[PDB]
Amino acid sequence: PSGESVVATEAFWDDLQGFLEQRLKDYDEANKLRVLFKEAWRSSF
Amino acid sequence: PSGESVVATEAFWDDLQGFLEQRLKDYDEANKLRVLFKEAWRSSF
């Protein structure tokens, strides 16, 4: 992986939010960041 | 943690990029995303 196709996966963002949940201790906030970061990644194109 | 003060830490973003490195298998790409996502988080304010 060069680092893109995996980022384009729901699995990536699920685990990404999983990490966010671990650190932030908040599902909803981690969810907000999952979306925000994914949209930022979308703007990376 | 409500999910913000930890996100405001370099440690958070370091581990965040660590996760990105694990999945993406690329330090530079993971770094790009660390910055991008952090700037997105900045725009969350």
PDB file of C-alpha atoms in Angstrom:
ATOM      1  CA  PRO A   1       0.000   0.000   0.000  1.00  0.00           C
ATOM      2  CA  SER A   2       1.265   3.446  -0.960  1.00  0.00           C
ATOM      3  CA  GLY A   3      -1.254   4.998   1.402  1.00  0.00           C
ATOM      4  CA  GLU A   4      -4.525   5.923  -0.272  1.00  0.00           C
ATOM      5  CA  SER A   5      -6.586   2.902  -1.295  1.00  0.00           C
ATOM      6  CA  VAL A   6      -6.744   1.803   2.344  1.00  0.00           C
ATOM      7  CA  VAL A   7      -7.687   5.336   3.384  1.00  0.00           C
ATOM      8  CA  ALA A   8     -10.528   5.031   0.912  1.00  0.00           C
ATOM      9  CA  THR A   9     -12.028   2.202   2.950  1.00  0.00           C
ATOM     10  CA  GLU A  10     -14.809   2.278   5.494  1.00  0.00           C
ATOM     11  CA  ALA A  11     -12.709  -0.155   7.509  1.00  0.00           C
ATOM     12  CA  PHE A  12      -9.931   2.437   7.734  1.00  0.00           C
ATOM     13  CA  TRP A  13     -12.273   5.126   8.984  1.00  0.00           C
ATOM     14  CA  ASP A  14     -13.942   2.676  11.364  1.00  0.00           C
ATOM     15  CA  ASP A  15     -10.623   1.811  13.002  1.00  0.00           C
ATOM     16  CA  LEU A  16      -9.627   5.471  12.775  1.00  0.00           C
ATOM     17  CA  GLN A  17     -12.701   6.349  14.821  1.00  0.00           C
ATOM     18  CA  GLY A  18     -11.862   3.395  17.037  1.00  0.00           C
ATOM     19  CA  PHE A  19      -8.547   5.052  17.839  1.00  0.00           C
ATOM     20  CA  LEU A  20     -10.361   8.331  18.377  1.00  0.00           C
ATOM     21  CA  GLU A  21     -12.734   6.623  20.789  1.00  0.00           C
ATOM     22  CA  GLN A  22      -9.839   5.102  22.730  1.00  0.00           C
ATOM     23  CA  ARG A  23      -8.118   8.460  23.178  1.00  0.00           C
ATOM     24  CA  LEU A  24     -11.102  10.824  23.371  1.00  0.00           C
ATOM     25  CA  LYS A  25     -13.331   8.501  25.386  1.00  0.00           C
ATOM     26  CA  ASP A  26     -16.330   9.691  23.362  1.00  0.00           C
ATOM     27  CA  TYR A  27     -18.141   7.938  20.520  1.00  0.00           C
ATOM     28  CA  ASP A  28     -19.926  11.007  19.168  1.00  0.00           C
ATOM     29  CA  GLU A  29     -16.849  13.226  19.167  1.00  0.00           C
ATOM     30  CA  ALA A  30     -14.801  10.471  17.569  1.00  0.00           C
ATOM     31  CA  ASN A  31     -17.541  10.189  14.981  1.00  0.00           C
ATOM     32  CA  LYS A  32     -17.428  13.935  14.272  1.00  0.00           C
ATOM     33  CA  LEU A  33     -13.701  13.685  13.732  1.00  0.00           C
ATOM     34  CA  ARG A  34     -14.075  10.593  11.547  1.00  0.00           C
ATOM     35  CA  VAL A  35     -16.334  12.588   9.244  1.00  0.00           C
ATOM     36  CA  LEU A  36     -14.286  15.771   9.424  1.00  0.00           C
ATOM     37  CA  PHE A  37     -11.013  13.998   8.716  1.00  0.00           C
ATOM     38  CA  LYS A  38     -12.594  11.972   5.920  1.00  0.00           C
ATOM     39  CA  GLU A  39     -13.856  15.164   4.294  1.00  0.00           C
ATOM     40  CA  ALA A  40     -10.412  16.682   4.692  1.00  0.00           C
ATOM     41  CA  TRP A  41      -8.985  13.602   3.013  1.00  0.00           C
ATOM     42  CA  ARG A  42     -11.595  14.082   0.307  1.00  0.00           C
ATOM     43  CA  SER A  43     -10.230  17.585  -0.206  1.00  0.00           C
ATOM     44  CA  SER A  44      -6.770  16.028  -0.562  1.00  0.00           C
ATOM     45  CA  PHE A  45      -7.853  14.975  -4.049  1.00  0.00           C
TER      46      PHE A  45
ATOM     47  CA  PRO B   1     -11.829  13.344  28.611  1.00  0.00           C
ATOM     48  CA  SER B   2     -14.749  14.742  26.633  1.00  0.00           C
ATOM     49  CA  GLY B   3     -12.676  14.501  23.474  1.00  0.00           C
ATOM     50  CA  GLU B   4     -10.806  17.691  22.637  1.00  0.00           C
ATOM     51  CA  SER B   5      -7.968  18.428  25.050  1.00  0.00           C
ATOM     52  CA  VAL B   6      -6.318  15.142  24.080  1.00  0.00           C
ATOM     53  CA  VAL B   7      -6.849  15.949  20.403  1.00  0.00           C
ATOM     54  CA  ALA B   8      -5.001  19.171  21.102  1.00  0.00           C
ATOM     55  CA  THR B   9      -1.871  17.213  21.972  1.00  0.00           C
ATOM     56  CA  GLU B  10       1.150  16.432  19.849  1.00  0.00           C
ATOM     57  CA  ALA B  11       1.056  12.979  21.421  1.00  0.00           C
ATOM     58  CA  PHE B  12      -2.413  12.414  19.960  1.00  0.00           C
ATOM     59  CA  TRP B  13      -1.325  13.395  16.479  1.00  0.00           C
ATOM     60  CA  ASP B  14       1.871  11.367  16.818  1.00  0.00           C
ATOM     61  CA  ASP B  15      -0.074   8.202  17.634  1.00  0.00           C
ATOM     62  CA  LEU B  16      -2.659   9.200  15.031  1.00  0.00           C
ATOM     63  CA  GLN B  17       0.101   9.236  12.427  1.00  0.00           C
ATOM     64  CA  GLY B  18       1.369   6.010  13.960  1.00  0.00           C
ATOM     65  CA  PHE B  19      -1.966   4.417  13.130  1.00  0.00           C
ATOM     66  CA  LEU B  20      -1.790   5.942   9.672  1.00  0.00           C
ATOM     67  CA  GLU B  21       1.670   4.464   9.192  1.00  0.00           C
ATOM     68  CA  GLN B  22       0.468   1.021  10.271  1.00  0.00           C
ATOM     69  CA  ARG B  23      -2.402   1.024   7.777  1.00  0.00           C
ATOM     70  CA  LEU B  24      -0.917   3.055   4.913  1.00  0.00           C
ATOM     71  CA  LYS B  25       2.593   1.626   5.179  1.00  0.00           C
ATOM     72  CA  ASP B  26       4.005   5.074   4.387  1.00  0.00           C
ATOM     73  CA  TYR B  27       5.548   7.625   6.742  1.00  0.00           C
ATOM     74  CA  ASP B  28       5.269  10.606   4.409  1.00  0.00           C
ATOM     75  CA  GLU B  29       1.654   9.962   3.456  1.00  0.00           C
ATOM     76  CA  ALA B  30       0.748   9.379   7.085  1.00  0.00           C
ATOM     77  CA  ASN B  31       2.465  12.662   7.849  1.00  0.00           C
ATOM     78  CA  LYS B  32       0.453  14.486   5.173  1.00  0.00           C
ATOM     79  CA  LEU B  33      -2.730  13.129   6.690  1.00  0.00           C
ATOM     80  CA  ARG B  34      -1.603  14.015  10.214  1.00  0.00           C
ATOM     81  CA  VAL B  35      -1.255  17.629   9.105  1.00  0.00           C
ATOM     82  CA  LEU B  36      -4.392  17.640   6.982  1.00  0.00           C
ATOM     83  CA  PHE B  37      -6.540  16.106   9.701  1.00  0.00           C
ATOM     84  CA  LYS B  38      -5.055  18.420  12.323  1.00  0.00           C
ATOM     85  CA  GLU B  39      -5.909  21.436  10.175  1.00  0.00           C
ATOM     86  CA  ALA B  40      -9.401  20.050   9.701  1.00  0.00           C
ATOM     87  CA  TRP B  41      -9.656  19.708  13.461  1.00  0.00           C
ATOM     88  CA  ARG B  42      -8.432  23.290  13.699  1.00  0.00           C
ATOM     89  CA  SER B  43     -11.339  24.287  11.469  1.00  0.00           C
ATOM     90  CA  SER B  44     -13.631  22.451  13.895  1.00  0.00           C
ATOM     91  CA  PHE B  45     -13.207  25.446  16.198  1.00  0.00           C
TER      92      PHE B  45
END
